[PDB]
Amino acid sequence: SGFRKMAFPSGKVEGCMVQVTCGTTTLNGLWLDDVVYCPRHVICTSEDMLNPNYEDLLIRKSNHNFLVQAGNVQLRVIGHSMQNCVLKLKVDTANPKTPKYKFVRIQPGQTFSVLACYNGSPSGVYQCAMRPNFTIKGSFLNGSCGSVGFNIDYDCVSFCYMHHMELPTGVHAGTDLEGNFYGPFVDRQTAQAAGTDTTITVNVLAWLYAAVINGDRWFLNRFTTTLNDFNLVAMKYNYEPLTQDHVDILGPLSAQTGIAVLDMCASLKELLQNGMNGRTILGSALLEDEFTPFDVVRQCSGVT
């Protein structure tokens, strides 16, 4: 028993972290096979971060200008190319610590682990979610660019995120591993609209099922609702509309607890309309939406 914001073990990713320097800028790189991936703004100075012409800036750079250090050893750069907002630096040595990996583009509402890094060295690991507005609420400082988000299926690391930018709001923006930004963001020093964020309803419901599994049952009531009635409530409280695809994914959690999905939606409705009343659920005084139904099953069953 017990329920925690659990991140994946970071070892397979720690072995891929390198430091990338170019000009006077240093950030993190991801060394998989003979390629180092890093945010393309490594080639920029503060003056051109206002409106950078990356193609033109990259033209003034040669392989020898990209200094890639793996721990305390220098990697030799034999090729460079820009794919969207990332640079791929071909190195002459394949990373001996490359795990089985995939590059995936996660959906909004999905969760992943982040290994925050500075100068190619890991400082910490935390679990977070891709918000519906395609931002992440991470913990990142200057130098953290190139830090990656990932998931692990048995031995395979699915890299889903690379950190690029901090918004003026303090929220974070970044790309998938092909350099495509999640959301409308562009790698420019210009104020950019994050957009209205919503609460991931299916995730809150999964966390309510985790709460029942771990003894917290005060919020369960004698009521039920329909998808249409519940969605009127979700709309009012800026919660994502619940669909039958959401209910289907909540099936395993419903079967384990014997609480029908719509019965749990009625508990959520009452919690939204009435609040917690000074009570807690799994040590939280607010409704948590950063655990997917898969996360809850995984944590509650001990999948390694």
Ligand X SMILES: O=C(Cc1cccc(Cl)c1)Nc1cnccc1C1CC1
**Least CB distance from residue 136 to a second copy, whole Å?**
9
**145 catalytically annotated:** yes
Q: Which does 165 bind (CB under 5 to 8 A by kind): a second copy, ligand X, none?
A: ligand X
What single letter denotes the amino acid at residue 274? N
Q: How far apart are CA 210 and CA 204, in angstroms?
A: 10
Q: How far apart are CA 113 and CA 100, in angstroms?
A: 17
Listed residue (101, 96, 35) closest to 68, CA to CA: 35
Nearer to a second copy, 59 or 141 (CB): 141
**172 catalytically annotated:** no
Nearer to ligand X, 131 or 164 (CB): 164
Q: How far apart are CA 61 and CA 176, in angstroms?
A: 24
**Least CB distance from residue 163 to a second copy, whole Å?**
11
Terminal Cα distance for the chain, rounded? 16
Nearer to a second copy, 93 or 139 (CB): 139
Q: Exactly one of 44, 145, 265, 300 is catalytic; which is it? A: 145
For position 278 contacting a second copy by CB under 8 A, the verdict is yes
- Applying CB under 8 A, the span of 79-87, 111-119, 174-182, 220-228 interacting with a second copy comes to 111-119
Distances (CA, A) of 17 to 6, 111, 118, 173: 21, 21, 10, 20
For position 7 contacting a second copy by CB under 8 A, the verdict is yes
Q: Vertex 294, ends 101 and 111: CA angle to 5°?
A: 60
Q: Exactly one of 38, 41, 44, 85 is catalytic; which is it? A: 41
Asked if 103 and 177 count as a contact pair (C-beta separation under 8 A), the reply is yes
For every residue of 157-181, DSSP letters joined together read EEEEEEEEEE-TTS-EEEE-TTSPB
For position 272 contacting a second copy by CB under 8 A, the verdict is no
**Least CB distance from residue 224 to ligand X, whole Å?**
32
Using CB under 6 A as the criterion, which residues of the chain lie in contact with ligand X when the complex forms?
A: 41, 49, 140-142, 144-145, 164-166, 187-189
What single letter denotes the amino acid at residue 229? D
Nearer to ligand X, 35 or 171 (CB): 171
Rg, C-alpha atoms of the chain:
21
Q: Which does 67 bind (CB under 5 to 8 A by kind): ligand X, a second copy, none?
A: none
For position 5 contacting a second copy by CB under 8 A, the verdict is yes
For position 26 contacting a second copy by CB under 8 A, the verdict is no
Listed residue (237, 240, 213, 236) closest to 286, CA to CA: 237
Which of 85, 87, 91, 116 touches a second copy (CB under 8 A)? Answer: 116
> What is the set of active-site residues?
41, 145
